[PDB]
């Protein structure tokens, strides 16, 4: 029962984590070996940059345009900017674009996705000059298709780069994200690493470290196995042939996601994968994007992402049960996540019901130990001392993800805030009631027993460590040490207006 569950948890989690670490290390070594053999000033591959956005801050859009203009790639054909809207408010983005780039702004009255002639020559005539499109407001997916059509009409290009309207790119991000495409002809898509620039909130730093760890281990293992699922925004690469082949199936699929938002980059990668085309991911290409600072917004978008995750894990299992020897790694990750969630729920229920101080201290101690080991590994890999803040991610995970997944599975099982936040409130109330019952049931003091002394010492040490971490974070905020160097200059530039 409990012994079997804890043993299975330990062995399976340790094996899976070791596998991810070794796979990420091997992928990094292989990528470094591939990069070390390339010649200097390599610009053989011709690529085009496509930018899509809607209701984007003009400052962030201007910074993204400047970062695109700061790229050192010497084989850039053109820049495609598509705005999902043709209203008076949407003209601010076009005006901002005219300040950073040419004034070649077009306002077609039709949408290529809903027109008989889907070719890009209907709305474009010259490919030498950069073009800006102000289409009627339809959605993010429609904007991507127009960019693909505009890039497809030029036979000179060989690949495309997809970034968000708020993405900040390094001077070598474009070259690094398109270099591995020519290394292996079987590679048709490359994923780019994404970082969070703003870290002025306790939630923002935690989600930034979570994203960094995700890109480091899961995407690294997927890159090593050449079966990457996380491909798309805010930084990615795609070859012209695969997008030309799969543009129609991607846009003809029924969409039930966010209205005029959340362009389906998941199903595009699924379409690439189901055709037997290998996909790799690189961490050298670095992209910068913002993160929400509201816990409620975080919870609701996690619920939406959990629903997505369900549909796309079914889809990717169906698509990856074709590779034969390979393709089972995604299914293994799926079962790993499902069993991890199930065992966390079972362990929490067991701890709530049995209410014994002996086992709870051991469980919290081993959880703290493994979290500290993970944080130390993250700090060693990132060469940054700020990665130790990941120990606080367990609290936000337990308090936000579990209600989000519960709501996601309840929605798809067999009043706007009732279906979004009532489940979280009930979960919090249940956790509080379980804690109160545990404290009341075990309310006693006995210093003549070593086991009680050991449990009390462990609890006191855990609380002391948590308080020390919180104090370190608080003093770091005042000294502005935790602030990203990119964030500081962005804040100064915003202050200068």
């Amino acid at each position: 029962s409990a012994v079997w569950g804890i043993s299975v948890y330990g062995v399976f989690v340790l094996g899976f984590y070791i596998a991810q670490i070794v796979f990420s290390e091997f992928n990094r070594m292989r990528l470094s070996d591939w990069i070390s053999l390339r010649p200097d000033n390599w610009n053989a591959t011709r690529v085009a940059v496509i930018i899509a956005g809607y209701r984007e801050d003009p400052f962030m859009f201007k910074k993204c345009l400047e970062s695109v203009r700061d790229s050192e790639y010497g084989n850039v054909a053109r820049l495609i900017c598509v705005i999902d809207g043709d209203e008076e408010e949407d003209l601010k983005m076009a005006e901002i674009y005219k300040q950073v780039y040419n004034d070649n702004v077009k306002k077609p009255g039709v949408v290529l996705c809903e027109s008989e002639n889907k070719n890009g020559s209907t709305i474009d005539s010259d490919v030498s000059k950069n073009i800006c499109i102000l289409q009627p407001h339809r959605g993010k997916r429609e904007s991507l298709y127009t960019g693909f059509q505009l890039a497809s009409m030029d036979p000179s290009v060989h690949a495309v780069v997809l970034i968000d309207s708020d993405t900040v790119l390094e001077k070598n991000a474009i070259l690094e994200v398109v270099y591995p495409l020519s290394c292996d002809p079987n590679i048709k898509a490359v994923a780019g690493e994404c970082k969070i620039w703003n870290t002025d909130t306790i939630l923002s730093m935690l989600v930034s470290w979570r994203y960094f760890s995700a890109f480091n281990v899961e995407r690294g293992a997927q890159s090593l196995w050449k079966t990457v699922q996380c491909v798309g925004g805010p930084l990615g690469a795609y070859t012209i042939d695969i997008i030309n082949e799969i543009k129609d199936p991607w846009i003809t699929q029924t969409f039930l996601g966010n209205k005029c938002t959340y362009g389906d980059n998941r199903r595009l990668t699924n379409e690439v994968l189901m055709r037997g085309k290998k996909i790799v991911y690189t961490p050298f290409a670095v992209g910068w994007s913002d993160s929400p600072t509201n816990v409620m917004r975080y919870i609701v978008q996690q619920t939406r992402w959990s629903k997505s995750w369900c549909r796309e894990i079914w889809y990717t299992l169906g698509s990856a049960w074709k590779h034969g020897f390979s393709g089972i790694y995604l299914a293994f990750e799926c079962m790993y996540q499902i069993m991890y969630f199930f065992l966390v729920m079972y362990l929490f229920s067991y701890i709530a019901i049995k209410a014994d101080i002996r086992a709870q201290t051991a469980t919290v101690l081993v959880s703290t130990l493994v979290t500290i080991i993970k944080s130390s590994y993250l700090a060693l890999r990132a060469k940054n001392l700020k990665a130790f803040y990941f120990v606080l991610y367990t609290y936000v995970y337990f308090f936000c993800m579990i209600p989000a997944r519960i709501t996601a599975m309840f929605t798809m099982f067999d009043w706007l805030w009732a279906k979004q936040f009532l489940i979280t409130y009930m979960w919090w109330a249940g956790v509080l009631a379980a804690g109160v019952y545990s404290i009341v049931d075990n309310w006693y003091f006995d210093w003549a027993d070593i086991q009680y002394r050991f449990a009390l010492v462990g609890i006191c040490s855990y609380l002391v460590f948590v308080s020390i971490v919180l104090v370190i974070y608080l003093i770091g905020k005042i000294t502005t040490w935790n602030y990203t160097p990119l964030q500081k200059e962005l804040i100064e530039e915003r202050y200068l207006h």
Partner: nanobody
Amino acid sequence: QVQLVESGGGLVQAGGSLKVSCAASGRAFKTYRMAWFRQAPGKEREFVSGISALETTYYADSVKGRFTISRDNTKNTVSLQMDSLKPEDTAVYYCAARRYGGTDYTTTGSYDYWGQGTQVTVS
């Protein structure tokens, strides 16, 4: 606030086994430390055996390999198994209970609860 009562004892031959059980009435017996004491006719009570809420067993003066103490939370009672009794062990036994305490667990003043006690004799 728990009331301790005793039920057991009697006249037993030397070298035999005798069983004594104690019953307590309260709200939550699972969180009370339990202990046993004996009153010799000419001496003062000494700690012989005690069990805490975490099933920790304490023995002294050859009780480690002679007597066994256990408690049953379902029945809300505690019993002390005694094997191979000796003539000099004849004394009346009182049980003690405690909820809050420190390192001291042998003195009579450490425990704030006591029972009427049962008389055990060895022939």
